């Protein structure tokens, strides 16, 4: 029974690793977009600078 529980735990750990990798990739893309927004905003307002 303990072996079964440990096997299930390992499967769940693998799923958590996949979730974490997906989150990291999506956050990287989001940060790239936010950096684009910040660059656009900084380059703007030069008329008002």
């Amino acid at each position: 029974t303990s072996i079964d529980s440990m096997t299930e735990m390992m499967n769940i750990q693998t799923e958590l690793a996949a979730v974490s990798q997906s989150m990291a990739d999506k956050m990287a893309q989001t940060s790239d977009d936010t950096a684009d927004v910040r660059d656009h905003l900084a380059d703007f307002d030069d008329f008002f600078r």
Binding site: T1, S2, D4, S5, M6, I12
Partner: protein, 48 residues
């Protein structure tokens, strides 16, 4: 947040296994201690 409860629900099974193992160890200790002490009592002063 859906994965976490699975890890929560996995845990109780192992604790029951540990508890049963502890009970088995205590019973084994009692049995073997009784056997050894009984044998030593019977074999004492048998070289007379």
């Amino acid at each position: 947040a859906d994965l976490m409860p699975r890890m929560v629900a996995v845990m109780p099974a192992q604790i029951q296994s540990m508890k049963n193992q502890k009970q088995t160890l205590l019973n084994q200790y009692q049995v073997q201690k009784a056997q050894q002490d009984q044998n030593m009592a019977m074999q004492e002063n048998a070289t007379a």
